[PDB]
Design a protein around this ligand. Structure first.
Ligand SMILES: [Mg+2]
Ligand SMILES: [Mg+2]
Ligand SMILES: [Mg+2]
Ligand SMILES: [Mg+2]
Ligand SMILES: [Mg+2]
Ligand SMILES: [Mg+2]
Ligand SMILES: [Mg+2]
Ligand SMILES: [Mg+2]
Ligand SMILES: [Mg+2]
Ligand SMILES: [Mg+2]
Ligand SMILES: [Mg+2]
Ligand SMILES: [Mg+2]
Ligand SMILES: [Mg+2]
Ligand SMILES: [Mg+2]
Ligand SMILES: [Mg+2]
Ligand SMILES: [Mg+2]
Ligand SMILES: [Mg+2]
Ligand SMILES: [Mg+2]
Ligand SMILES: [Mg+2]
Ligand SMILES: [Mg+2]
Ligand SMILES: [Mg+2]
Ligand SMILES: [Mg+2]
Ligand SMILES: [Mg+2]
Ligand SMILES: [Mg+2]
Ligand SMILES: [Mg+2]
Ligand SMILES: [Mg+2]
Ligand SMILES: [Mg+2]
Lengths: 64, 75, 145, 266
RNA sequence: ACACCAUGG
RNA sequence: AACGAGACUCUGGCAUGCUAACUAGUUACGCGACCCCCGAGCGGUCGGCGUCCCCCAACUUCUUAGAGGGACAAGUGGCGUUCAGCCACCCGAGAUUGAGCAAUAACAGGUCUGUGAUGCCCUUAGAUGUCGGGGCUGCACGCGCGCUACACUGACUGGCUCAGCGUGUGCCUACCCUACGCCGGCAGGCGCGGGUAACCCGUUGAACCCCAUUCGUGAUGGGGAUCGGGGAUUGCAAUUAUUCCCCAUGAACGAGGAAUUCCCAGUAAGUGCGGGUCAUAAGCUUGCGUUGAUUAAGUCCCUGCCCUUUGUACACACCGCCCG
RNA sequence: AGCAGAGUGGCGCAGCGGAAGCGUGCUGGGCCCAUAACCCAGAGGUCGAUGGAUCGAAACCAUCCUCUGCUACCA
């Protein structure tokens, strides 16, 4: 329940998910060891190269 | 609404407190002086122009919709 | 400065000395803003004073100019009862004569039973406005029996 | 002011709140068994089964009993729930609420006469007097109302510590308009059927002997609901003392009609 | 991993 | 092979290149003149302000409007069966302005009250073909499009400073747009001129905005309904107030329930101005400028649309059919 | 006549002293091409009457009245 914050850099834009097409699937690396990668659903207008902040990085996105 | 019963002109207590606040306030505007005491807000303008005349406060900006003063350009 | 008595009781109405004179005396009927400003200018008193800052030798002059305007060169096109229908006078009717004149005018109209008096009797609109979709005071009517 | 010894609400407590309005994410509410801090019930946290319209199971302006799910004492946040509210908890919550409001309303004459220029008067009076009025039987199961329950039925506690001015004659008046009267129910079942003419003045030797070993004139109830079932109740006392005086009444009154002639029910 | 969704001068 | 799409027409953005202009201007000085030293200086010479006056001065930058030019996914890098094409970037006035026009087939859609378009039926002199008066506006109530507000990112009072699209003397039909002088607080009146118009109103001194005063959280100096009394103009006639002006009265309304409309860049919204109807007159509509955002670069969830496969007891086509 | 329960919106009712709402009915809106269902708002109160306590009640106490169930059933 106690985890620090993790900054993650976006390296690929996959597609638009959600019922209205309202959020985006994005693949990120973890700013500490580039050998890590996860998939997240981002809410805003994400480009490639941006840095997201993760309040919970042990999760992963399935879809929707 | 509500009920804000402000004073139309000073009494001696408020009148001395208005001169005992001069060194204390970093920002002086009519609205702040209205909220500190119970002043009709159009009396606060006259009070601050009077204090300014006596060199007790320093004018930093005057505009139609805003006036700003500060304590003696110090601290 | 000079926390003195403020609440005034001018003829048949209460003025608050907490306000400026030109907007304090408008509390009396028949006296609006355009009238009060002129009545205060003709009386040569200042216009930045609160209505409580007037001693008993100003208020009297203000009201005696307010009640006899044509004496102090207030014009005719400016008074609220001109060519008085039944006496030919020009006057400002001020405080209680206003309601009396209004009721007397309505009763005059109803007496000869003109059309304006009949619209005033039935509580309808006296000018020529449509009444099909405005006014709307009563209650909703049910259509299902 | 504050209604409770605890300044802030704690986790897993049923607070009796007032729904003040509803935002896109939750009903913001006024807590009033505490100070008047703002709280939020989340719209997801509001029911377990599907809701047909919200303007039924909440209406703005109704007090209702909702549990706490999170509190942040650092910056003043309270989160609340209605999924997590039991009917048996619903039994005790407004009990606690009304029993706290009684002690808040008794602490009014004080604010009525004391330094009501500030309301810190009532806060100080609370932390002084009402803080200690409940720490003596709280876990046993009494609030701050037991002290005043005893104040007029057995005045020894208010004088066991500071007693102040013009507050006594207000509380020893008003709580004995409401809490003090005895739960009297003990109508004795006196069933007999005699076959003698003096059978009315044969029990009259005991008709005055409802309560025994006392004064002859002490007030009792003269009852008749049926010729076969006569009825008795005596000096009221408290209902276990009432049962102690009544325990043999059905028998000590019967022991006089059995002796003349005829055998009755015992 | 599927709430409700009837009828027609 | 044909239609529709596209192409096409008008429009907005660019040309210091062309054509050429007292019914448009610029600059120059010929000037001449006013004014102030505001500069060296003296104040003059040099300058500074001018919608003050002239040029048979030189020119077309601004204005006008004609002819041509110019943008093509043309250049460069990626992605593409290396095809059709897509993304990014340099250069550029611009790399996706806005409208007009629009198919086969159809609807018992609207219009007989636009018509000297029209079939049939009715009436036709006690007319269903003309004058006077009333109505189309009446008010317990239900609904639609809208105007003004709920104030301090404001109201009031002064000062300052900027537009564009238009219209303008009428034949029957009798009326147009106004300058400037005087008179009146105001609406308005009298007197003399210009314009059939890039010529006169007009350099269209527009509003919001900008700069200073008074107000002070109070249904208040917010709001302007309702109503009393008076003064003008149009007209043959103003009462059921035509419109306009003045003093007075001073209602609801403190941001709006369930629902629901419109919108992607000079766009939404704020703001004023013209045309239409108009003897009189816009809270309407149709065009024009002025200040000028937040949010998107997506999806098929909701409402619908297009194409393919599939199912059907429907074809008056699911608002269908049909069982007890 | 007696016991017990109840007396609150047209109707069924909730309401352990800081004091008027729920469910149904009624009227008008919403949603739909339209009707039912469903959503919203409005209207309608001597809290049975009379006194008393209480700082204060619809609520507590006392008297009376009116309904309902059950025995009593009574010259
Ligand atoms: Mg259906
Ligand atoms: Mg049926
Ligand atoms: Mg059927
Ligand atoms: Mg059918
Ligand atoms: Mg072919
Ligand atoms: Mg290429
Ligand atoms: Mg460039
Ligand atoms: Mg185009
Ligand atoms: Mg077509
Ligand atoms: Mg036709
Ligand atoms: Mg025909
Ligand atoms: Mg017609
Ligand atoms: Mg004719
Ligand atoms: Mg006629
Ligand atoms: Mg009509
Ligand atoms: Mg329409
Ligand atoms: Mg506006
Ligand atoms: Mg217009
Ligand atoms: Mg015109
Ligand atoms: Mg017009
Ligand atoms: Mg129209
Ligand atoms: Mg829609
Ligand atoms: Mg297609
Ligand atoms: Mg098929
Ligand atoms: Mg068939
Ligand atoms: Mg069907
Ligand atoms: Mg059948």
């Amino acid at each position: 329940r106690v985890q620090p914050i993790k900054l993650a850099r976006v390296t690929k834009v996959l597609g638009r998910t959600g019922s209205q097409g309202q959020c985006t699937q994005v693949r990120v690396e973890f700013m500490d060891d580039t050998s890590r990668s996860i998939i997240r659903n981002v809410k805003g207008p994400v480009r490639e190269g941006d840095v997201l902040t993760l309040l919970e990085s042990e999760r992963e996105a399935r879809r929707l | 609404r509500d009920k804000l019963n402000n004073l139309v002109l000073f009494d001696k207590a408020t009148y001395d407190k208005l001169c005992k606040e001069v060194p204390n306030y970093k920002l002086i505007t009519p609205a702040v002086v209205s909220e500190r005491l119970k002043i009709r807000g159009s009396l606060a303008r006259a009070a601050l122009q009077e204090l300014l005349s006596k060199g007790l406060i320093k004018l930093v900006s005057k505009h139609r919709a805003q006036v700003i003063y500060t304590r003696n350009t110090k601290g | 400065p000079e926390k003195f008595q403020h609440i005034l009781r001018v003829l048949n109405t209460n003025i608050d000395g907490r306000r400026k004179i030109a907007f304090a005396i408008t509390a009396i009927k028949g006296v609006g803003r355009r009238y009060a400003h002129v009545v205060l200018r003709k009386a040569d008193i200042d216009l930045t004073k609160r209505a409580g800052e007037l001693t008993e030798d100003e208020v009297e002059r203000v009201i005696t100019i307010m009640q006899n305007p044509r004496q102090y060169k207030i014009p005719d096109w400016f008074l609220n009862r001109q060519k008085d229908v039944k006496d030919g006078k020009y006057s400002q009717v001020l405080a209680n004569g206003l309601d009396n004149k209004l009721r007397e005018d309505l009763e005059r109209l109803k007496k000869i039973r003109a059309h304006r008096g009949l619209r005033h009797f039935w509580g309808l609109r006296v000018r020529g406005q449509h009444t099909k979709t405005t006014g709307r005071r009563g209650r909703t009517v049910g259509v299902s029996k | 002011c504050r209604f409770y010894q605890h300044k802030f609400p704690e986790v897993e407590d049923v607070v009796m709140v007032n729904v003040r309005s509803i935002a896109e994410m939750g009903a913001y509410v006024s807590l009033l068994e505490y100070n008047n801090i703002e709280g939020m019930i989340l719209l997801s946290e509001l029911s377990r089964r599907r809701i047909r319209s919200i303007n039924k199971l909440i209406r703005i302006g109704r007090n209702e009993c909702v549990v706490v799910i999170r509190v942040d004492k650092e910056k003043g946040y309270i989160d609340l729930s209605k999924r997590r509210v039991s009917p048996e908890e619903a039994i005790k919550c407004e009990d606690k609420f009304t029993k706290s409001k009684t002690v808040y309303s008794i602490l009014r004459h004080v604010a009525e006469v004391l330094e009501y220029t500030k309301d810190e008067q009532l806060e100080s009076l609370f932390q002084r007097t009402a803080w200690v009025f409940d720490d003596k039987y709280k876990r046993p199961g009494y609030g701050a109302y037991d002290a005043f329950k005893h104040a007029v039925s057995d005045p020894s506690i208010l004088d066991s510590l500071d007693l102040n001015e013009d507050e006594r004659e207000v509380l020893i008046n008003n709580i004995n308009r409401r809490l003090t009267p005895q739960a009297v129910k003990i109508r004795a079942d006196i069933e007999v059927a005699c076959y003698g003419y003096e059978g009315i003045d044969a029990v009259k030797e005991a008709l005055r002997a409802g309560l025994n070993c006392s004064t002859e004139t002490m007030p009792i109830k003269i009852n008749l609901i049926a010729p076969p079932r006569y009825v008795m109740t005596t000096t009221t006392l408290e209902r276990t003392e009432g049962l102690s005086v009544l325990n043999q009444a059905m028998a000590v009154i019967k022991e006089k009609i059995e002796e003349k002639r005829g055998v009755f029910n015992v």
